[PDB]
Amino acid sequence: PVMEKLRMFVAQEPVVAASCLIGGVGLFLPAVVRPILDSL
Amino acid sequence: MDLIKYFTFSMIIFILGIWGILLNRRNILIMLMSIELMLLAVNLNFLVFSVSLDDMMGQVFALLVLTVAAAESAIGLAIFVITFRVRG
Amino acid sequence: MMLEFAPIFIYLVISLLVSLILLGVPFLFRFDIRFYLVSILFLIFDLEVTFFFPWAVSLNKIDLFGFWSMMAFLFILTIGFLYEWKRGALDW
Amino acid sequence: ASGWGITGNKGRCYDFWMDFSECMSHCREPKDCTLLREDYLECLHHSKEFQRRNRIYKEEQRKL
Amino acid sequence: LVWLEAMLPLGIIGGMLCIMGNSQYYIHKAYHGRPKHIGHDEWDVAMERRDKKVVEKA
Amino acid sequence: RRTILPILQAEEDERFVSEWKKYLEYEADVMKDVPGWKVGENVYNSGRWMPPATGELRPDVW
Amino acid sequence: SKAAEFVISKVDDLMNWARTGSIWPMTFGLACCAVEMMHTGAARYDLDRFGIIFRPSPRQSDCMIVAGTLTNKMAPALRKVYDQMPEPRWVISMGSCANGGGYYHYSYSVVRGCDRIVPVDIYVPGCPPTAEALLYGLLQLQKKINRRKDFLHWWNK
Amino acid sequence: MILSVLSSLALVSGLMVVRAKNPVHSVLFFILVFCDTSGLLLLLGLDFFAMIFLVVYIGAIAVLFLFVVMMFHIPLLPTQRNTTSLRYTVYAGKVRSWTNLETLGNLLYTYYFVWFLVSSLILLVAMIGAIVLTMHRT
Amino acid sequence: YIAVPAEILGIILPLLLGVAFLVLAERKVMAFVQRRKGPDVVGSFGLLQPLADGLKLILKEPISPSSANFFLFRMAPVATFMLSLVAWAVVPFDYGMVLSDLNIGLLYLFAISSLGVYGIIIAGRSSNSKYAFLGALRSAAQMVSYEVSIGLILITVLICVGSCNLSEIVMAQKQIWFGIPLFPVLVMFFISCLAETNRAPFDLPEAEAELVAGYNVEYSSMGFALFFLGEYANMILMSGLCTLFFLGGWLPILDLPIFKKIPGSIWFSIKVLFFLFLYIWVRAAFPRYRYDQLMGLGWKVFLPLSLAWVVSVSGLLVTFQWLP
Amino acid sequence: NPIPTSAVLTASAKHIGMRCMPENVAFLKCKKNDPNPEKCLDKGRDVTRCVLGLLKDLHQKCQKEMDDYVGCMYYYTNEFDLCRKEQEAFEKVCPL
Numbered sequence A: 001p002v003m004e005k006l007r008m009f010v011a012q013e014p015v016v017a018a019s020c021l022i023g024g025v026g027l028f029l030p031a032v033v034r035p036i037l038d039s040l
Numbered sequence B: 001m002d003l004i005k006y007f008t009f010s011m012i013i014f015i016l017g018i019w020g021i022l023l024n025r026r027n028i029l030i031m032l033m034s035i036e037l038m039l040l041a042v043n044l045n046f047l048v049f050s051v052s053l054d055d056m057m058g059q060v061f062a063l064l065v066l067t068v069a070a071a072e073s074a075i076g077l078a079i080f081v082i083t084f085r086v087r088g
Numbered sequence C: 001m002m003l004e005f006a007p008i009f010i011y012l013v014i015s016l017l018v019s020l021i022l023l024g025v026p027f028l029f030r031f032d033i034r035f036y037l038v039s040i041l042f043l044i045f046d047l048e049v050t051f052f053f054p055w056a057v058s059l060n061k062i063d064l065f066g067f068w069s070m071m072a073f074l075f076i077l078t079i080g081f082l083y084e085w086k087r088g089a090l091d092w
Numbered sequence D: 001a002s003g004w005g006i007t008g009n010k011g012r013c014y015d016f017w018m019d020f021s022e023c024m025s026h027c028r029e030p031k032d033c034t035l036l037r038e039d040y041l042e043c044l045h046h047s048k049e050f051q052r053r054n055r056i057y058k059e060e061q062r063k064l
Numbered sequence E: 001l002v003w004l005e006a007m008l009p010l011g012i013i014g015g016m017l018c019i020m021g022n023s024q025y026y027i028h029k030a031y032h033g034r035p036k037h038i039g040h041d042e043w044d045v046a047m048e049r050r051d052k053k054v055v056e057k058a
Numbered sequence F: 001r002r003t004i005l006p007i008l009q010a011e012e013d014e015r016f017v018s019e020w021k022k023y024l025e026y027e028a029d030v031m032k033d034v035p036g037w038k039v040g041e042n043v044y045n046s047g048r049w050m051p052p053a054t055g056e057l058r059p060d061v062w
Numbered sequence G: 001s002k003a004a005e006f007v008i009s010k011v012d013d014l015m016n017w018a019r020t021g022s023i024w025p026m027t028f029g030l031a032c033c034a035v036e037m038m039h040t041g042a043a044r045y046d047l048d049r050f051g052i053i054f055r056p057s058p059r060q061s062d063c064m065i066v067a068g069t070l071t072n073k074m075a076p077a078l079r080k081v082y083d084q085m086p087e088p089r090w091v092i093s094m095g096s097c098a099n100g101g102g103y104y105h106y107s108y109s110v111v112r113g114c115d116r117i118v119p120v121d122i123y124v125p126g127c128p129p130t131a132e133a134l135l136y137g138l139l140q141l142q143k144k145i146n147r148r149k150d151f152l153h154w155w156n157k
Numbered sequence H: 001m002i003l004s005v006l007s008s009l010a011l012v013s014g015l016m017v018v019r020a021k022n023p024v025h026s027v028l029f030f031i032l033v034f035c036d037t038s039g040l041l042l043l044l045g046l047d048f049f050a051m052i053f054l055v056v057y058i059g060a061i062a063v064l065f066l067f068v069v070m071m072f073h074i075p076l077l078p079t080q081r082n083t084t085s086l087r088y089t090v091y092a093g094k095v096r097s098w099t100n101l102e103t104l105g106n107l108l109y110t111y112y113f114v115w116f117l118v119s120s121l122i123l124l125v126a127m128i129g130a131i132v133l134t135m136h137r138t
Numbered sequence I: 001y002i003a004v005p006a007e008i009l010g011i012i013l014p015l016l017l018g019v020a021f022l023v024l025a026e027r028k029v030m031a032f033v034q035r036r037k038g039p040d041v042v043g044s045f046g047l048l049q050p051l052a053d054g055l056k057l058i059l060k061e062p063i064s065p066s067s068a069n070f071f072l073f074r075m076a077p078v079a080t081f082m083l084s085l086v087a088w089a090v091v092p093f094d095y096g097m098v099l100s101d102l103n104i105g106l107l108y109l110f111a112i113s114s115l116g117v118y119g120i121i122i123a124g125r126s127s128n129s130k131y132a133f134l135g136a137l138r139s140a141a142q143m144v145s146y147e148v149s150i151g152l153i154l155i156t157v158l159i160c161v162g163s164c165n166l167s168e169i170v171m172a173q174k175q176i177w178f179g180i181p182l183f184p185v186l187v188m189f190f191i192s193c194l195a196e197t198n199r200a201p202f203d204l205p206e207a208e209a210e211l212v213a214g215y216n217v218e219y220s221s222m223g224f225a226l227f228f229l230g231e232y233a234n235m236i237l238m239s240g241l242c243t244l245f246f247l248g249g250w251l252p253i254l255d256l257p258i259f260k261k262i263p264g265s266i267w268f269s270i271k272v273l274f275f276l277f278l279y280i281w282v283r284a285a286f287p288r289y290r291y292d293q294l295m296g297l298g299w300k301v302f303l304p305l306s307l308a309w310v311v312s313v314s315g316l317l318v319t320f321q322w323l324p
Numbered sequence J: 001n002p003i004p005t006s007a008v009l010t011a012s013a014k015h016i017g018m019r020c021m022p023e024n025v026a027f028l029k030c031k032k033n034d035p036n037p038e039k040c041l042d043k044g045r046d047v048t049r050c051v052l053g054l055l056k057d058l059h060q061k062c063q064k065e066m067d068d069y070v071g072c073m074y075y076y077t078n079e080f081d082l083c084r085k086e087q088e089a090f091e092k093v094c095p096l
């Protein structure tokens, strides 16, 4: 599965994984959370 | 009369850049500075025209011109350093 | 609204005068490509900052459209920087 | 012409341009309301007003 | 106790940093009669001009 | 600021009409010869009025 | 001219105080005396208290401390480095090897004293001198600097 | 009179750029040309562009050029007796007056957003081109 | 309109004496960290030591042949010093304690910081040496590289406040400092300011420039000292930028309406000196960082991460409609 | 009695915005239709006279609590949030 390769990548590159995680959060909030709170 | 002064100054910068690029066929470095001078003169033309007419299409396009100027300078110096590697 | 730059001009003139009076006190008594590459990356990632500056200030006026256009711009430059990273040209 | 002003309110010449365009939108010959086109053009540069003030200054100067 | 000697130069530089601001504030207040406004926009400069003119007239 | 300007706009209009009639009587005074001068007229063929132009681009920043 | 004599005296005192309160020696330690002189700059016998900080270059150093044996191969380098120094240019000869021969003093490749290459002002003897001995030598150098009426001598000449 | 002397000095610097004796001084005068130009824009009333000219032209382009050079070696007549008092100021519109930055960003990323992405593509072309040509990596 | 030069001198002279006493503080704090006293003999607590240093530097022969065109070498210190001073004309000390009131005043700071690269470059080139120029060029490349991280962090700050004006940035921090939420961003900005002034573990470029050469160039007596003065003024400026943006510029830190006797002019100075103490602490707590890994770090752990922080702040603010 | 300077008008704008509403609306409608100062002249005096009457009334009814408000507004360059003290001292006696 992809989990082993993903975890090995996170272990070797901490800064890139952290940057991707924060960027994914910052892109997921306005693309998913925003429409569902727009409709209350 | 300040629009006239602005336009004449920009036009003289433009013709001076043309003068610089035309004379020295070999420097290849003054040519890039002259091209930058031409782009600068045109940017001032656009900004001054935008201020005079109270229209915003002049400043938007003037700001977009900077990307072209920077890209042209970067590629120009890349090709320049490639050319210089052959001789000397 | 823009008279506040003449103080900057006078400050600059006085600072130059102070530098002169500071330097005049005793008187009264070969090629590397990597440098070019880092300069190019700085230029490219400085144009993006100059583009960010109007976006951040006017971000309130524009909702879910300017933000996503700037995100597309960032994604394009991120693809560029990813090609930059893997190819090399980023470490010494 | 575009209608986006520098100060953020409106182009000072936008209303004249829209009047000219609306006239031309239902006028197959341009000669009928070329007056609006002239108004828009000299609203951009204020040519006629400057010519009139030049004439006034010439009348001042000829008194020498 | 004993580490105050290291904090004396910090105190000197901080005190001169605060008199840095206070000097220009007191100089500007002395002649203009008012402190400097945070936001000078075109509307604010317009009323400043009109206030100067009306005060001169009065 | 939106409940204060009508009086400021009113006094600006008063000052401008004072200056405008002064300039109109000055212009009619100089031009008594060369018949065909219609003194002060709207150069705008549409009839809409705009403030007298000045050859100073962006004057409201200095 | 007695009225100004007070002014010249005060100017001379101020100049000597300025030159004594801030001495920037240049470390030229090249033998076991360098270890003792390094202990002198350490936490215990703090040199930085007396305004003494070592400099890595001779172009911005007040005095020069020659600590260690000066062989024949190094004497030209010592002289060259001493030449690139400003006007005050004091020299301290720390250790027995530096201030005249030393434990060797009889060798094909030992200069019998750094005073045969550069003019020395203070001799600090010991093999190796204690950190207190080096501090006493530096205090003696400071006292020597106080006896400088350089402005008065310029006035009288 | 501030405009005249600044424009003249900029013109002199631009002239000396093309007739320079060595590339170093050519780049040095090239920097002064943009310094004067930014000052002129500042006089014009556009503070944002006046400082982008420092950030881009003499912030990155001039540094790039210097790095490369280091190695590899009808008008209205001046009569204004009765015009400085004929200024009609419309106070409406002074309230909530935007700057040169808010106005630009209002319509740069929202209405004319295709050209913005085109400029991004231009930047990407420059970034790729600077690498393909000059990666020796020996 | 003749009041300006008094303000200019009142901003300049305290800055120079503060630079001198900041050098003294550097020496004293490094001494105390290493269980020492530092300059104590001169003056009372070493307070007269910088004065003695200055009078000693003046009373020395100047080595000024300059071995060159005689012009470019004397203009580099002037340029760097005038830039490091003009960057101080926009700092809003308390409320009216600001010299110039730029409506942007932040892109202006970015431009001034970016322009402070030519000084060292032309200093290295004018100094005719085959390694001093190269070291100056590496230092310039380092500053240029960390400028982009500085700019991205500035954009992160500017998104929250919504306006470029420096005074309004502090005005917007009545609720919280912006340092509590953006603490990783604060650390990034501190490290970037630390690495952009060659005043850090990020120091090796110039460190080897003297080790292999000894500065055997045209070393003016105190004409060279203008570089040092400008570098320490930049230290103070970039120490104050952190307390303008991430800490409250002049607002009380954690305060009930009881400690209102003190003014806001010293709330700024205390944070500035705290950040200066942190500068000295970081210098005398860490080993130097190689230039091979300096560039790689500055390009691969700060640009992507600061860009991600920009993206996350913008996305979170937009989602919940929390914009200014 | 007070001259309609920048400080007094900004300070009393709160009261102007609830008692001068019809005249201000009429003047705004007149100005929107035509930019002529000559055509907007007649409506440009009604607002002036009503605002001057309001200033007279405020000066007489709230005398001591308005002078300090104007002085502090002039001192702080019309920044409401800074002081506000003489502000509530002003609407304490003037009921608006």
Ligand code: SF4
Pocket: G031, G032, G033, G067, G068, G069, G094, G095, G096, G097, G098, G102, G103, G126, G127, G128, G129
């Ligand atoms: S004096 Fe003694 S310790 Fe010093 S260098 Fe000579 S032998 Fe070594």
